[PDB]
Design an enzyme around this catalytic site. Sequence first.
Site, PDB file in Angstrom:
ATOM      1  N   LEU A  11       0.426  -1.289  -0.288  1.00 35.12           N
ATOM      2  CA  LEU A  11       0.039  -0.243   0.001  1.00 35.12           C
ATOM      3  C   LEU A  11       1.289   1.466  -0.320  1.00 35.12           C
ATOM      4  CD1 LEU A  11      -2.783  -1.512   1.955  1.00 35.12           C
ATOM      5  CD2 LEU A  11      -3.185  -1.040   0.171  1.00 35.12           C
ATOM      6  N   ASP A  12       0.251   2.587  -0.102  1.00 35.08           N
ATOM      7  CA  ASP A  12       0.788   3.808  -0.273  1.00 35.08           C
ATOM      8  C   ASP A  12       0.961   4.641   1.478  1.00 35.08           C
ATOM      9  OD1 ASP A  12       1.612   4.734  -2.799  1.00 35.08           O
ATOM     10  OD2 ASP A  12       0.118   3.525  -3.095  1.00 35.08           O
ATOM     11  N   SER A  13       1.461   5.327   2.205  1.00 37.01           N
ATOM     12  CA  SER A  13       1.556   5.296   3.513  1.00 37.01           C
ATOM     13  C   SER A  13      -0.232   6.390   3.463  1.00 37.01           C
ATOM     14  CB  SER A  13       2.453   7.636   2.982  1.00 37.01           C
ATOM     15  OG  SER A  13       3.105   7.179   1.438  1.00 37.01           O
ATOM     16  N   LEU A  14      -0.632   7.487   1.722  1.00 36.41           N
ATOM     17  CA  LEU A  14      -1.796   8.080   1.917  1.00 36.41           C
ATOM     18  C   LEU A  14      -2.546   6.618   2.624  1.00 36.41           C
ATOM     19  CD1 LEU A  14      -0.773   8.929  -1.751  1.00 36.41           C
ATOM     20  CD2 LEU A  14      -1.917  10.742   0.248  1.00 36.41           C
ATOM     21  N   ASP A  15      -2.533   5.390   2.205  1.00 39.03           N
ATOM     22  CA  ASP A  15      -3.405   4.408   2.921  1.00 39.03           C
ATOM     23  C   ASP A  15      -2.983   4.077   4.530  1.00 39.03           C
ATOM     24  OD1 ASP A  15      -5.188   3.022   0.700  1.00 39.03           O
ATOM     25  OD2 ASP A  15      -4.669   1.106   2.320  1.00 39.03           O
TER      26      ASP A  15
END
Length: 99
Positions: free
Chosen positions: A47-51
């Site tokens: 996943l991404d940091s935004l997640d």
Amino acid sequence: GSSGSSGMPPLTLEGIQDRVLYVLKLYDKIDPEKLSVNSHFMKDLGLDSLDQVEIIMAMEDEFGFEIPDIDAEKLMCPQEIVDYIADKKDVYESGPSSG
């Protein structure tokens, strides 16, 4: 519709974890099968940091806490959170808590 029954047993670690997963489950983005108490988010899920901010924020709400980016960043697994929760061991402690 179609109601039945659903109680809310005591508060125990068994609830923290389950919640950690449950919350993570609620996230379609995060698959349950892959999801695991010992399953990374970027190393496994990817996943991404935004997640990360979300997932974390999810626990901060599901439990009602304030995990800083300094921590949320240190958190890369669901079990890592449980530890943070377990420690808290219920939030039924005094303090200036307003609605």
